[PDB]
Amino acid sequence: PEYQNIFNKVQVREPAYPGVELPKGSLPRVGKPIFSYWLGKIGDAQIGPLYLGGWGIASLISGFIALEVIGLNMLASVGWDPRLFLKEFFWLGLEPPPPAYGLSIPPLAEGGWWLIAGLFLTMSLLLWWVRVYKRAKDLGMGTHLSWAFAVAILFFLTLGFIRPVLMGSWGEAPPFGIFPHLDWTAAISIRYGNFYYNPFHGLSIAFMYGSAVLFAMHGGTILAVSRYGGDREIDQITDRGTAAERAMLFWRWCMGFNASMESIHRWAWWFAVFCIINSILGIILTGTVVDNWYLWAVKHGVAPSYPSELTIDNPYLT
Amino acid sequence: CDFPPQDVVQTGYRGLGMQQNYNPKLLQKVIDATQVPDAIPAAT
Amino acid sequence: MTRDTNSNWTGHVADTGVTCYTCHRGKPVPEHVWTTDPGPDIPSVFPSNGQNTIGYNVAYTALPFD
Amino acid sequence: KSTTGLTEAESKEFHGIFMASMTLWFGLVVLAHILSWLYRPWL
Amino acid sequence: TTGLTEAESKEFHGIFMASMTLWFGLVVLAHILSWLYRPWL
Amino acid sequence: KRVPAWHAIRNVRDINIQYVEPLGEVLPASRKGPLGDPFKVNCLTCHQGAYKPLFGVPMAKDYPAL
Amino acid sequence: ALLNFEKKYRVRGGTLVGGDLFDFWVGPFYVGFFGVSAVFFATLGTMLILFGAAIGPTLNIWQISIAPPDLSVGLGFAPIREGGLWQVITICAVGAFVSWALRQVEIARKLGMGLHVPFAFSFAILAYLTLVFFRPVLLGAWGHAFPYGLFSHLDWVSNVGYQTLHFHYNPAHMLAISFFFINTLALAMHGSLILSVVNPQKGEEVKTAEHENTVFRDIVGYSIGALAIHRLGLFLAINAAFWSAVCMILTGPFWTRGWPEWWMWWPNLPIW
Amino acid sequence: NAKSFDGMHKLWMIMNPVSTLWAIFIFQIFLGLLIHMVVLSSDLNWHDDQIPVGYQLQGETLPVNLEMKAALKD
Amino acid sequence: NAKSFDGMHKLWMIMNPVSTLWAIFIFQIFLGLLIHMVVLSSDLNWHDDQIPVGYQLQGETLPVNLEMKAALK
Amino acid sequence: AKSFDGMHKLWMIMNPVSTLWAIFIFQIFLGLLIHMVVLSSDLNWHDDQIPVGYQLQGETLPVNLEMKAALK
Amino acid sequence: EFGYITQYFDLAQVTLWAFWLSLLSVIFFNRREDKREGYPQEAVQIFGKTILTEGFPFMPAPKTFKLPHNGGDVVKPGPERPQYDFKLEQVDRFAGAAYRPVGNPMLAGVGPGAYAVRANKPDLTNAGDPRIVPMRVAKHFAVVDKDPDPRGMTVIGADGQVGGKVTEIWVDRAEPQVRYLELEAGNKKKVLVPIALCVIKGQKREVKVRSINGIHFNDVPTLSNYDQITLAEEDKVSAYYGAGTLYATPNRAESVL
Amino acid sequence: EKPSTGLTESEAKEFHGLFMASMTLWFGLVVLAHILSWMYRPWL
Numbered sequence A: 001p002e003y004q005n006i007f008n009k010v011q012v013r014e015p016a017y018p019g020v021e022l023p024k025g026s027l028p029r030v031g032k033p034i035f036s037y038w039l040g041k042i043g044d045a046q047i048g049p050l051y052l053g054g055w056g057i058a059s060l061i062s063g064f065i066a067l068e069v070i071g072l073n074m075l076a077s078v079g080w081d082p083r084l085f086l087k088e089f090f091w092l093g094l095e096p097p098p099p100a101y102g103l104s105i106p107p108l109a110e111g112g113w114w115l116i117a118g119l120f121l122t123m124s125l126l127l128w129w130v131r132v133y134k135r136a137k138d139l140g141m142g143t144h145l146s147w148a149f150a151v152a153i154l155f156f157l158t159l160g161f162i163r164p165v166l167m168g169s170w171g172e173a174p175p176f177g178i179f180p181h182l183d184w185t186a187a188i189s190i191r192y193g194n195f196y197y198n199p200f201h202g203l204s205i206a207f208m209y210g211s212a213v214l215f216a217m218h219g220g221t222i223l224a225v226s227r228y229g230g231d232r233e234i235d236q237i238t239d240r241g242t243a244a245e246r247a248m249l250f251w252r253w254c255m256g257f258n259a260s261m262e263s264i265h266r267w268a269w270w271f272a273v274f275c276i277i278n279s280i281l282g283i284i285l286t287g288t289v290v291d292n293w294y295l296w297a298v299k300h301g302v303a304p305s306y307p308s309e310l311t312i313d314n315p316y317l318t
Numbered sequence B: 001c002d003f004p005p006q007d008v009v010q011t012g013y014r015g016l017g018m019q020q021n022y023n024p025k026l027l028q029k030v031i032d033a034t035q036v037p038d039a040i041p042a043a044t
Numbered sequence C: 001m002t003r004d005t006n007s008n009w010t011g012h013v014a015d016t017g018v019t020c021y022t023c024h025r026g027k028p029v030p031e032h033v034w035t036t037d038p039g040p041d042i043p044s045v046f047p048s049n050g051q052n053t054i055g056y057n058v059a060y061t062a063l064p065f066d
Numbered sequence D: 001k002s003t004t005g006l007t008e009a010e011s012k013e014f015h016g017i018f019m020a021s022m023t024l025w026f027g028l029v030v031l032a033h034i035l036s037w038l039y040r041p042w043l
Numbered sequence E: 001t002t003g004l005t006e007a008e009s010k011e012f013h014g015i016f017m018a019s020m021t022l023w024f025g026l027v028v029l030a031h032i033l034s035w036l037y038r039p040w041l
Numbered sequence F: 001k002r003v004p005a006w007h008a009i010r011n012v013r014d015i016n017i018q019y020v021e022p023l024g025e026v027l028p029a030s031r032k033g034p035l036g037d038p039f040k041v042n043c044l045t046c047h048q049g050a051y052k053p054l055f056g057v058p059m060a061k062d063y064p065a066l
Numbered sequence G: 001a002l003l004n005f006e007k008k009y010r011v012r013g014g015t016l017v018g019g020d021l022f023d024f025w026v027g028p029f030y031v032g033f034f035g036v037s038a039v040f041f042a043t044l045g046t047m048l049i050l051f052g053a054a055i056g057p058t059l060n061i062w063q064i065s066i067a068p069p070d071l072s073v074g075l076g077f078a079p080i081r082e083g084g085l086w087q088v089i090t091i092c093a094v095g096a097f098v099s100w101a102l103r104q105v106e107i108a109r110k111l112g113m114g115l116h117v118p119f120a121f122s123f124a125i126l127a128y129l130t131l132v133f134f135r136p137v138l139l140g141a142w143g144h145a146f147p148y149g150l151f152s153h154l155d156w157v158s159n160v161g162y163q164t165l166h167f168h169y170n171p172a173h174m175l176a177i178s179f180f181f182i183n184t185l186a187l188a189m190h191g192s193l194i195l196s197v198v199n200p201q202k203g204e205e206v207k208t209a210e211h212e213n214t215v216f217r218d219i220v221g222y223s224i225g226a227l228a229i230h231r232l233g234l235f236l237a238i239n240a241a242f243w244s245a246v247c248m249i250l251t252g253p254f255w256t257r258g259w260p261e262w263w264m265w266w267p268n269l270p271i272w
Numbered sequence H: 001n002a003k004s005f006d007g008m009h010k011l012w013m014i015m016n017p018v019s020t021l022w023a024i025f026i027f028q029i030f031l032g033l034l035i036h037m038v039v040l041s042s043d044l045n046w047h048d049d050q051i052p053v054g055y056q057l058q059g060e061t062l063p064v065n066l067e068m069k070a071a072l073k074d
Numbered sequence I: 001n002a003k004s005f006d007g008m009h010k011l012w013m014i015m016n017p018v019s020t021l022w023a024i025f026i027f028q029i030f031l032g033l034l035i036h037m038v039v040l041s042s043d044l045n046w047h048d049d050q051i052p053v054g055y056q057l058q059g060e061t062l063p064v065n066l067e068m069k070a071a072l073k
Numbered sequence J: 001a002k003s004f005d006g007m008h009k010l011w012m013i014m015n016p017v018s019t020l021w022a023i024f025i026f027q028i029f030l031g032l033l034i035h036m037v038v039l040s041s042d043l044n045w046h047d048d049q050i051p052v053g054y055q056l057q058g059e060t061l062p063v064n065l066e067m068k069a070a071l072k
Numbered sequence K: 001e002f003g004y005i006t007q008y009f010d011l012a013q014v015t016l017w018a019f020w021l022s023l024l025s026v027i028f029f030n031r032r033e034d035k036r037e038g039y040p041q042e043a044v045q046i047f048g049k050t051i052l053t054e055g056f057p058f059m060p061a062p063k064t065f066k067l068p069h070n071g072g073d074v075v076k077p078g079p080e081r082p083q084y085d086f087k088l089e090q091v092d093r094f095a096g097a098a099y100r101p102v103g104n105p106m107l108a109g110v111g112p113g114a115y116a117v118r119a120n121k122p123d124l125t126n127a128g129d130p131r132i133v134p135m136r137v138a139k140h141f142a143v144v145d146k147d148p149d150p151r152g153m154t155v156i157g158a159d160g161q162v163g164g165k166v167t168e169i170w171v172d173r174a175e176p177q178v179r180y181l182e183l184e185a186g187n188k189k190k191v192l193v194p195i196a197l198c199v200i201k202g203q204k205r206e207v208k209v210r211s212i213n214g215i216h217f218n219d220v221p222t223l224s225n226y227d228q229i230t231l232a233e234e235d236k237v238s239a240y241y242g243a244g245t246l247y248a249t250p251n252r253a254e255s256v257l
Numbered sequence L: 001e002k003p004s005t006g007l008t009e010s011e012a013k014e015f016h017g018l019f020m021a022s023m024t025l026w027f028g029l030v031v032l033a034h035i036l037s038w039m040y041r042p043w044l
């Protein structure tokens, strides 16, 4: 057939690019850039350099302290054996305090290490937030990447710090494992009567499906007009060429309305952020306001009603 | 892997899930282990 | 114990009942039994939480193993 | 006007062979059904 | 086309057929041994 | 089928509280676990992976001793 | 209505079936043979869903439900009131989805572009056909598919999941969820970056491609590029769909135990 | 009434022969698969009807297998 | 009606031979796999029918294995 | 019998090297598949305990039996 | 009592309403941002009169892009540059009918061969230099071995005929990668072909261009100066290759089945 | 404006000869396989 533009057939090298000049008073960039042939088959081949200033070092100290703690407790749970660590790795975890301790600080091997790791991971993510903000603002760009990051951090803090405090127990938070955190997911659905009848859960699922749909559509459309220079979106925005025109006619003819080369990126932004906004809203109300989502859905006229034919006798009533 | 086909028993309204699933090769191991004991003649 | 179960618990074993063979199956020690699980070996100052292992009796999940 | 580039002679030729082939195919179908009726009658 | 002339095609065909015949011979031998050891039909 | 299981639970507790655990005095050290308690009864001790033990053949009616 | 620049692109040709008979527009839409087909099948399917709601107990939007046949029908034909309506609607649905994809192909041919979007749509279609055709055929009955109803296909999803005691431990399910999550993350970052470069700090010029590379190399140390992020996008979404189809074709036809017990192959390797 | 179908051969001056051939072949294969699957799912099924004999049942009752299974109880 | 199939060889002037060859080969391989799998899933299965003998059962009742299993009890 | 004469011209429309690679890869995949299909049936030859069961043979050695006696 | 109810109104309900209203309102703002290109639209009336309409919701107020290196201001929604001179005949007498090109379809600029009217300036780097340039002007680039160097190969053209030979590679300095191949045609002109319409076979040492035919490489649009390319010229070149996807052979626009 | 494959009439005759020979041989092998299967395990 015709070239599909999925891999780079011919590669070219020039000396590495150090980066746009920073404002005066900045630290130098660390690292000497290297090139990857395999990364260059699909994208850009340069790796590095990297910018390490004040906020991105405090972050990376916090995060690595947290990682050391989590790893060592997982390793103590098998008796220090690395062979068993590799053998049973998906079943290990660091577990939260027993719920009877409330919001106090428990002893170290009965939930205090969980508390330490949570605190250090929190600080890591807030320092990283400041780094992302300043990096985009020192180059003179809008700070749109910090708004979305803030939303994600808020969801991490909701399930984990805010909801456990509003409930009165640290033992309501997830543990640090793979299968352990999957077990937490299932159990919190079972305890509060079926998350499928949580309406914010349904809306966030709507927006996660929509993210996949929209990004398949956009990735397809821009690869399909890259023969007319469509992959260069900044120029198509500030001087509309034939690639943008064809891209917008396609969708107009197909489904009756369209966006522009700049507006589709606002649709992307919002579809990714409403998913997490509804995530926060659905978790923050569970347990603190609603105790059984299925009974809520029945009270508000939402759940179907299968035919019965039988009678089952509740043995606690007999 | 449990290669097809299977045996399925419906146990509820249609379109609701609610059914039990058997693999004929695994169920043979439970059948091959029961062995009801033999009767003892009733007493005078 | 067998007489008690066969007479007083028919809400569960209804008119089929149990004999010895229902559990011993011709051996003096039954095949599937349990005891209070201590858990894996961990450091001496670490108390057991009772989970996050393989868990052979709870269908190989990371759920509480006893 | 929509046309296929075949002249009238080419169309006549194609039609001859097309009809012969379709007749042979239907003959084989009839034979298969006679055998099936002899083995396992369904009506 | 493949860029092979007719002589090159004849050569390739000769060796291809010889190799395929030898391979099928070995397959038949393996099955005779298996039938002698563990007959399946 | 949820209503027999409800009784089953209670039944098993009886077997273990009244009969099997008090036998921890009589049995040797061979029939005990790490924590020093005897082997006890589960759902698997008589079903053994079937929806009814031995598919529900009624053996116990032929013996007036049980 | 036509856009400012639209008239010079509305030419004839590019079709698959039909020809010059259905080559026109109605308003902004383009019709074609497959446009007629799609609207025909969508209208018929919708009207049959509504009738199946009329013969049920309620017209509440959340509680309508049309269910498939019983498992005793097998791969046969069910009565209209006990499953046949579901079969007719599920024929209409396939007709409409495939028509949609082929109409897309006609449009792209007319505008001179590549067929990436109908090709990515094909994988959604494949996941649907897995749930209504392939899995039911391998298990031996149409009554293994889901009913048509909001809130009522969710009961199906729940009970099917619990037929394996814990469906989170399904391996292809884990892989698909990984792709879904990473796709939402990537879409957020891409949206943010383009907006940020054409909407800079107050009183500044529009930035360039060098700025786009620099920002991510400063934060993270690697930048993938403006054309490869579109590729990465097509890739993550398609893979999500693909591994969903695999995870459902595995459950029932090729595995009947609990899903946690599959993973037992790993700690039983004779190498630890 | 006999001269009504004279110009029929001109059909191939408006309908493309190659497209038509491919369409016919593909449709016939699809229909063959479909009808075989529809008849196999009915009372007329011929693979599982145990005619002229049931072969799994025949294998379970071979004298050698029976004598081995009897020696497994003892 | 015997010289009715004379110009049949002209078929390859309108149908591409290489495309046709590839289509035939691929279809035949797919159909081979499919029919083998359909017949293996019926009463005609020939791998698990325990004919001419059951081999796992034959291994469970060998005198050496029986004498070793007795010596455990 | 001389009706397969121009057969050698096959390689003027089909690439020899691609065909060779395709054949080799297909044969390896099919070999693995058939071995796995036969191992999953009654014909399995690794676990059938013929000509003898070796784990069972190790459990009943006199030395192992006498050591297991001393632990109870 | 299992399903007893104490009070019908709760917080989850109100919050859900608030969300329905917060969506339903970003739709409004995004739909308004969608109409900074291509509007007001042209509605054709009962007997042919055309008016400008604006849709629902209405168009936003204009915003300004300030381009770098004194590249001017861009107001959007703002004025438009004038279309060129396409000729078209309608096929059926109603507003929704299709159009046919009047002359030679390859040299008409209608259909997939239409293009936009951009600036007559090159795209710039962050330093002010032209972005897309031949590899003899950018003296620091090199093709990575392990990859077929296309310089020297031939340009077979979709009907099996030869178009010309590759003589240069055009690179992109802002993001290092190949954008165009330059070739000498049958009448000794220098023409470009986009790299995303070329299948490069290293062993055959060919470049297959499925879009146009071999003789069609003589009429590809040419550049003013061969040390740079402008936005307008990029559009013209790419559009000429895109017209061939429907006009190269008379059978390409003619209903597969 | 007419579908062609670039083969002349001689080339088509040649291809047709070998195609028919090959198809006949293939069908012969199929018939032989089915006769053996009917002798071993008759299905109708």
Ligand code: BCL
Binding pocket: E023, E026, E027, E028, E030, E031, E034, E038, J024, J027, J028, J031, J032, J038, J043, J045
């Ligand atoms: C009960 C069933 C039998 C069994 C029944 C059969 C039957 C029947 C056959 C095999 C065949 C094979 N068996 Mg066995 N096999 C059994 C147990 C085993 C065990 C084991 C650990 O249990 C192993 C490792 C093997 C391995 C093998 C391979 C050697 C061979 C498959 C070749 C292949 O896939 O080539 C595919 C790869 C290619 C074609 C690539 C090209 C290879 C080139 C030509 C060079 C490779 C050399 C070649 C593989 C060896 C040539 C012989 C030399 C003179 C030594 N079998 C049991 C005991 N096995 C097949 C065979 O022998 O083929 C001739 C075969 O027909």
Ligand code: BCL
Binding pocket: A185, G097, G124, G125, G127, G128, G130, G131, G156, G157, G158, G159, G160, G161, G162, G167, G168, G173, G176, G177, G241, G243, G244, G245, G247, G248
């Ligand atoms: C107790 C239940 C189990 C569970 C049981 C199941 C079951 C059962 C299934 C999944 C499936 C999925 N699960 Mg799960 N799942 C659970 C927990 C999770 C969790 C989580 C956070 O806990 C996540 C993130 C997921 C995520 C997922 C995805 C991997 C997958 C759904 C995407 C998909 O199928 O796309 C595929 C896309 C489609 C099917 C869409 C079809 C699109 C069609 C062609 C177009 C329709 C157009 C329409 C009619 C037009 C309307 C037009 C209007 C004009 C607008 N599951 C719990 C543990 N899960 C599903 C799956 O994998 O199926 C393949 C599935 O069947």
Ligand code: BCL
Binding pocket: D025, D028, D029, D030, D032, D033, D036, D040, H025, H028, H029, H031, H032, H033, H039, H046, I035, L027
């Ligand atoms: C009780 C039910 C009967 C049964 C009743 C019928 C009836 C009735 C018919 C078939 C027909 C067919 N059956 Mg049956 N069939 C049964 C069981 C089988 C089984 C099996 C595993 O049990 C198989 C594999 C088949 C297979 C077949 C095909 C050979 C044929 C469908 C061909 C087709 O789709 O062409 C469509 C594809 C094309 C037209 C493309 C064009 C191909 C060209 C024309 C060349 C192809 C040759 C073709 C394969 C015929 C070969 C004949 C040669 C001269 C040897 N049947 C059972 C036993 N079967 C049909 C048939 O034979 O038609 C003539 C038919 O009418």
Ligand code: BCL
Binding pocket: E024, I025, I028, I029, I031, I032, I033, I046, J034, L026, L029, L030, L031, L033, L034, L037, L041
């Ligand atoms: C109860 C059922 C019988 C059985 C009944 C049948 C029947 C009936 C048939 C087969 C056929 C086949 N069987 Mg059987 N088969 C059984 C068990 C087996 C087992 C096994 C593991 O148990 C295997 C591996 C096979 C494998 C095979 C293939 C050799 C063949 C399918 C070829 C194909 O798909 O062409 C698809 C690929 C192509 C068409 C490409 C063509 C390439 C060219 C023409 C050359 C390739 C040669 C190819 C290997 C064929 C052998 C020719 C040589 C002389 C070796 N059968 C059981 C015992 N089997 C078919 C057959 O042999 O036709 C001749 C057939 O009609």
Ligand SMILES: CC(C)=CCC/C(C)=C\CC/C(C)=C/CC/C(C)=C\CC/C(C)=C/CC/C(C)=C/CC/C(C)=C/CC/C(C)=C/CC1=C(C)C(=O)c2ccccc2C1=O
Binding pocket: A213, A214, A217, A218, A219, A221, A222, A244, A247, A248, A251, A255, A256, A257, A258, A259, A260, A261, A264, A267, G026, G029, G030, G031, G035, G036, G039, G042
């Ligand atoms: C049904 C009925 C009663 C019919 C009667 C009417 C009659 C008689 C005939 C009409 C003719 C025909 C054939 C009509 C068919 C149309 C019908 C009826 C229905 C289809 C409508 C439909 C399926 C719409 C669904 C819309 C939805 C929900 C979309 C989901 C995704 C979404 C929200 C997208 C918003 C973002 C957008 C607009 C993305 C498109 C878009 C993308 C993705 C880019 O990448 C891109 C790149 C550069 C420039 C522009 C774009 C661009 O616009």
Ligand SMILES: COC(C)(C)CCC/C(C)=C/C=C/C(C)=C/C=C/C(C)=C/C=C\C=C(C)\C=C\C=C(C)\C=C\C=C(/C)CCCC(C)(C)OC
Binding pocket: A067, A068, A070, A071, A072, A075, A103, A104, A105, A115, A117, A118, A119, A122, A156, A157, A159, A160, A161, A173, A174, A175, A176, A177, A178, A181
């Ligand atoms: C052996 O390994 C070594 C040591 C060598 C290092 C290797 C590290 C490795 C292999 C690590 C593996 C890690 C894994 C698999 C981690 C899995 C992590 C997952 C999937 C985690 C999922 C969820 C956890 C969440 C959401 C936790 C949220 C916790 C929060 C928000 C904590 C909040 C606590 C706070 C803010 C502190 C309050 C404390 C105080 C003092 C105020 O209380 C009064």
Ligand code: HEM
Binding pocket: C005, C012, C013, C014, C015, C016, C017, C018, C022, F001, F002, F004, F005, F008, F009, F012, F041, F042, F043, F044, F045, F046, F047, F051, F052, F053, F056
């Ligand atoms: C807590 C674990 C147990 C559970 C959940 C359980 C559950 C059940 C259920 C649900 C049934 C009805 C089966 C059906 O009608 O399909 C049943 C039947 C039966 N169970 Fe159990 N059981 C348990 C333990 C036991 C034990 C320990 C024994 C032996 C002492 C036992 C003996 C029986 C017998 C004999 C029947 C058949 C009674 C009948 O025919 O109705 N069960 N059990």
Ligand SMILES: CCCCCCCCCCCCCCCCCC
Binding pocket: G036, G037, G040, G095, G098, G099
């Ligand atoms: C007045 C002449 C035209 C007649 C109207 C066209 C009716 C179209 C037929 C309905 C749809 C066809 C069914 C199958 C379509 C293809 C499936 C993908």
Ligand SMILES: [Ca+2]
Binding pocket: C004, F014, F018
């Ligand atoms: Ca009692």
Ligand SMILES: [Ca+2]
Binding pocket: H046, H047, H048, H049, H050, H051, H052, L043, L044
């Ligand atoms: Ca039969």
Ligand SMILES: [Ca+2]
Binding pocket: E040, E041, I046, I047, I048, I049, I050, I051, I052
């Ligand atoms: Ca056999």
Ligand SMILES: [Ca+2]
Binding pocket: J045, J046, J047, J048, J049, J050, J051
């Ligand atoms: Ca052996």
Ligand SMILES: [Fe+3]
Binding pocket: A218, A222, A233, G190, G194
């Ligand atoms: Fe983009």
Ligand SMILES: [Mg+2]
Binding pocket: A175, A180, A183, A184, C051, C052, C062, C063
């Ligand atoms: Mg846990």
